[PDB]
Design an enzyme around this catalytic site. Structure first.
Site, PDB file in Angstrom:
ATOM      1  N   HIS A  62      40.487  -1.573  -4.547  1.00 46.86           N
ATOM      2  CA  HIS A  62      42.018  -1.384  -3.777  1.00 46.86           C
ATOM      3  C   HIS A  62      42.997  -0.651  -4.232  1.00 46.86           C
ATOM      4  O   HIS A  62      43.967   0.073  -3.551  1.00 46.86           O
ATOM      5  CB  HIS A  62      42.558  -2.818  -3.344  1.00 46.86           C
ATOM      6  CG  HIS A  62      41.321  -3.584  -2.849  1.00 46.86           C
ATOM      7  ND1 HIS A  62      40.924  -3.504  -1.511  1.00 46.86           N
ATOM      8  CD2 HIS A  62      40.800  -4.746  -3.277  1.00 46.86           C
ATOM      9  CE1 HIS A  62      39.859  -4.318  -1.398  1.00 46.86           C
ATOM     10  NE2 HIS A  62      39.872  -5.225  -2.488  1.00 46.86           N
ATOM     11  N   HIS A  92      50.050  -1.906 -11.261  1.00 43.09           N
ATOM     12  CA  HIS A  92      49.454  -1.290 -10.323  1.00 43.09           C
ATOM     13  C   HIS A  92      49.989  -0.489  -9.455  1.00 43.09           C
ATOM     14  O   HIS A  92      51.470  -0.620  -9.391  1.00 43.09           O
ATOM     15  CB  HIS A  92      48.371  -1.945  -9.592  1.00 43.09           C
ATOM     16  CG  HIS A  92      48.972  -2.879  -8.605  1.00 43.09           C
ATOM     17  ND1 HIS A  92      49.070  -4.237  -8.928  1.00 43.09           N
ATOM     18  CD2 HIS A  92      49.372  -2.914  -7.471  1.00 43.09           C
ATOM     19  CE1 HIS A  92      50.025  -4.810  -8.123  1.00 43.09           C
ATOM     20  NE2 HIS A  92      50.031  -3.940  -7.076  1.00 43.09           N
ATOM     21  N   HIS A  94      50.481   1.478  -5.126  1.00 40.50           N
ATOM     22  CA  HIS A  94      50.237   1.747  -4.061  1.00 40.50           C
ATOM     23  C   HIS A  94      50.677   3.306  -3.670  1.00 40.50           C
ATOM     24  O   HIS A  94      51.824   3.616  -4.095  1.00 40.50           O
ATOM     25  CB  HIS A  94      50.874   0.763  -2.870  1.00 40.50           C
ATOM     26  CG  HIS A  94      50.627  -0.657  -3.430  1.00 40.50           C
ATOM     27  ND1 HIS A  94      49.777  -1.347  -2.537  1.00 40.50           N
ATOM     28  CD2 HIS A  94      51.077  -1.382  -4.137  1.00 40.50           C
ATOM     29  CE1 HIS A  94      49.667  -2.534  -3.348  1.00 40.50           C
ATOM     30  NE2 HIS A  94      50.547  -2.510  -4.209  1.00 40.50           N
ATOM     31  N   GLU A 104      55.277   0.633  -0.140  1.00 41.61           N
ATOM     32  CA  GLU A 104      55.105  -0.455   0.492  1.00 41.61           C
ATOM     33  C   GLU A 104      56.566  -1.183   1.019  1.00 41.61           C
ATOM     34  O   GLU A 104      56.812  -1.453   2.232  1.00 41.61           O
ATOM     35  CB  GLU A 104      54.473  -1.559  -0.355  1.00 41.61           C
ATOM     36  CG  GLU A 104      53.068  -1.414  -0.444  1.00 41.61           C
ATOM     37  CD  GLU A 104      52.294  -2.578  -0.869  1.00 41.61           C
ATOM     38  OE1 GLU A 104      52.493  -3.383  -1.723  1.00 41.61           O
ATOM     39  OE2 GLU A 104      51.079  -2.563  -0.163  1.00 41.61           O
ATOM     40  N   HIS A 117      53.976  -1.806  -9.056  1.00 41.52           N
ATOM     41  CA  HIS A 117      54.485  -3.234  -9.016  1.00 41.52           C
ATOM     42  C   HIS A 117      53.811  -3.631 -10.512  1.00 41.52           C
ATOM     43  O   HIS A 117      52.665  -3.548 -10.848  1.00 41.52           O
ATOM     44  CB  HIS A 117      53.494  -3.679  -8.170  1.00 41.52           C
ATOM     45  CG  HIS A 117      53.963  -3.583  -6.674  1.00 41.52           C
ATOM     46  ND1 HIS A 117      53.234  -3.829  -5.698  1.00 41.52           N
ATOM     47  CD2 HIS A 117      54.942  -3.179  -6.255  1.00 41.52           C
ATOM     48  CE1 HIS A 117      53.854  -3.385  -4.503  1.00 41.52           C
ATOM     49  NE2 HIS A 117      55.182  -2.845  -4.727  1.00 41.52           N
ATOM     50  N   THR A 196      51.422  -8.695  -1.480  1.00 42.23           N
ATOM     51  CA  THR A 196      51.207  -7.724  -0.401  1.00 42.23           C
ATOM     52  C   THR A 196      49.598  -7.179  -0.231  1.00 42.23           C
ATOM     53  O   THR A 196      49.314  -6.707   0.720  1.00 42.23           O
ATOM     54  CB  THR A 196      51.843  -6.302  -0.619  1.00 42.23           C
ATOM     55  OG1 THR A 196      51.259  -5.631  -1.648  1.00 42.23           O
ATOM     56  CG2 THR A 196      53.370  -6.621  -0.885  1.00 42.23           C
TER      57      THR A 196
HETATM   58  C1  LIG Z   1      40.283 -15.571  -8.209  1.00 43.66           C
HETATM   59  O1  LIG Z   1      40.832 -14.318  -7.739  1.00 43.66           O
HETATM   60  C2  LIG Z   1      41.074 -13.454  -8.851  1.00 43.66           C
HETATM   61  C3  LIG Z   1      40.382 -13.310  -9.851  1.00 43.66           C
HETATM   62  C4  LIG Z   1      40.751 -12.252 -10.811  1.00 43.66           C
HETATM   63  C5  LIG Z   1      41.759 -11.674 -10.668  1.00 43.66           C
HETATM   64  C6  LIG Z   1      42.806 -11.721  -9.741  1.00 43.66           C
HETATM   65  C7  LIG Z   1      44.103 -11.196  -9.455  1.00 43.66           C
HETATM   66  C8  LIG Z   1      44.889 -11.378  -8.474  1.00 43.66           C
HETATM   67  C9  LIG Z   1      46.207 -10.632  -8.363  1.00 43.66           C
HETATM   68  O2  LIG Z   1      46.821 -10.401  -9.308  1.00 43.66           O
HETATM   69  N1  LIG Z   1      46.679 -10.042  -6.980  1.00 43.66           N
HETATM   70  C10 LIG Z   1      47.683  -9.547  -6.725  1.00 43.66           C
HETATM   71  C11 LIG Z   1      48.516  -9.409  -7.552  1.00 43.66           C
HETATM   72  C12 LIG Z   1      49.743  -8.499  -7.358  1.00 43.66           C
HETATM   73  C13 LIG Z   1      50.024  -8.070  -5.590  1.00 43.66           C
HETATM   74  S1  LIG Z   1      51.302  -7.537  -5.238  1.00 43.66           S
HETATM   75  N2  LIG Z   1      50.827  -6.101  -4.549  1.00 43.66           N
HETATM   76  O3  LIG Z   1      52.169  -6.790  -6.409  1.00 43.66           O
HETATM   77  O4  LIG Z   1      51.994  -8.136  -4.426  1.00 43.66           O
HETATM   78  C14 LIG Z   1      48.906  -8.559  -5.078  1.00 43.66           C
HETATM   79  C15 LIG Z   1      47.715  -9.337  -5.309  1.00 43.66           C
HETATM   80  C16 LIG Z   1      44.359 -12.333  -7.364  1.00 43.66           C
HETATM   81  O5  LIG Z   1      45.084 -12.520  -6.407  1.00 43.66           O
HETATM   82  O6  LIG Z   1      43.237 -12.771  -7.317  1.00 43.66           O
HETATM   83  C17 LIG Z   1      42.324 -12.868  -8.583  1.00 43.66           C
HETATM   84 ZN   LIG Z   2      51.072  -4.106  -5.444  1.00 42.18          ZN
END
Ligand SMILES: COc1cccc2cc(C(=O)Nc3ccc(S(N)(=O)=O)cc3)c(=O)oc12
Ligand SMILES: [Zn+2]
Length: 258
Positions: A62, A92, A94, A104, A117, A196
């Site tokens: 992603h 990371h 987008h 975003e 982010h 997000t």
């Molecule tokens: C068991 O699921 C996971 C296993 C291993 C790693 C992860 C990492 C995750 C994570 O950091 N998700 C995430 C982080 C940041 C954003 S955002 N775009 O910054 O809002 C959106 C989603 C997450 O949601 O789930 C994870």
């Molecule tokens: Zn993000």
């Protein structure tokens, strides 16, 4: 048939697997700069990245994540709208297929070319997986990217992307200093929101900097050479990995600055 950013599995489909997609505090949002209220009670943001220890960079299908050792108090975000201490776990981006889209958050409907982010978890919950279950679990520092002059501090990231072209590839990525990705000013907007991407959990205090960083066209072009697919699968360029603005509903966006 898992979620993504394609025509069949993109943001408008996410609600089927993740009904919180239609929740009361979803992100991102449009920041209407004239209706955001200056809040003199907001503190300066404290970004202390002197001891940050990056470990690895990962293409997760992603985006790409630059991961940090978050096993000690070493790269922390405090102050601003936050109570307590939040530890950096990953950053990371987008980005778009073209320079006119990719962010975003939007500012008075303006889309930037990309958005960084920097993701932090509240140390009162002990680790990231527990923090995401809490309404004050995460603080994400969002920074807009516009295309112009190169960002010298981004080039080490850009140059490793060739080695993580496809989903599931990772590479050692030590000694990367995220201070080189920050703009001059720490003026910000803040509001309560969500992740997000799925699972879209409503656990984030968003802190979006007003001042974008500039990156070069060549830098962002290298982001766009990444792939959403795994090695040996049909090539799908990793572009347009952004969720559009969601309804603000019953929230206030606050400004740290007049
Ligand atoms: C068991 O699921 C996971 C296993 C291993 C790693 C992860 C990492 C995750 C994570 O950091 N998700 C995430 C982080 C940041 C954003 S955002 N775009 O910054 O809002 C959106 C989603 C997450 O949601 O789930 C994870
Ligand atoms: Zn993000």
């Amino acid at each position: 048939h898992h979620w993504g950013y394609g025509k069949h599995n993109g943001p408008e489909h996410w609600h089927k697997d993740f009904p919180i997609a239609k929740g009361e505090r979803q992100s991102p949002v449009d920041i209407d700069t004239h209706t955001a209220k200056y809040d003199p009670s907001l503190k300066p943001l404290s970004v202390s990245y002197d001891q940050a220890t990056s470990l690895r960079i990962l293409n997760n299908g992603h985006a790409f994540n630059v991961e940090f050792d978050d096993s000690q108090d070493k790269a922390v975000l405090k102050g601003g709208p936050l109570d307590g201490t939040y530890r950096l776990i990953q950053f990371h981006f987008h980005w778009g297929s073209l320079d006119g889209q990719g962010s975003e958050h939007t500012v008075d409907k303006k889309k930037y070319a990309a958005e960084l982010h920097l993701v932090h978890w509240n140390t009162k919950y002990g680790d990231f997986g527990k923090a995401v279950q809490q309404p004050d679990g995460l603080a994400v520092l969002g920074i807009f990217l516009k295309v112009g002059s190169a960002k010298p501090g981004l080039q080490k990231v850009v140059d490793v992307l060739d080695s993580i072209k496809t989903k599931g590839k990772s590479a050692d990525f030590t000694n990367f200093d995220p201070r080189g990705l920050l703009p001059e000013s720490l003026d910000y907007w803040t509001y309560p929101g969500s992740l997000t991407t799925p699972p879209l959990l409503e656990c984030v205090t968003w802190i979006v900097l007003k001042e974008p960083i500039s990156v070069s066209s060549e830098q962002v072009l290298k982001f766009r050479k990444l792939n959403f697919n795994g090695e040996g699968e049909p090539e799908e360029l990793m572009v347009d990995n952004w969720r559009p603005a969601q309804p603000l509903k019953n929230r206030q966006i606050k400004a740290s600055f007049k």
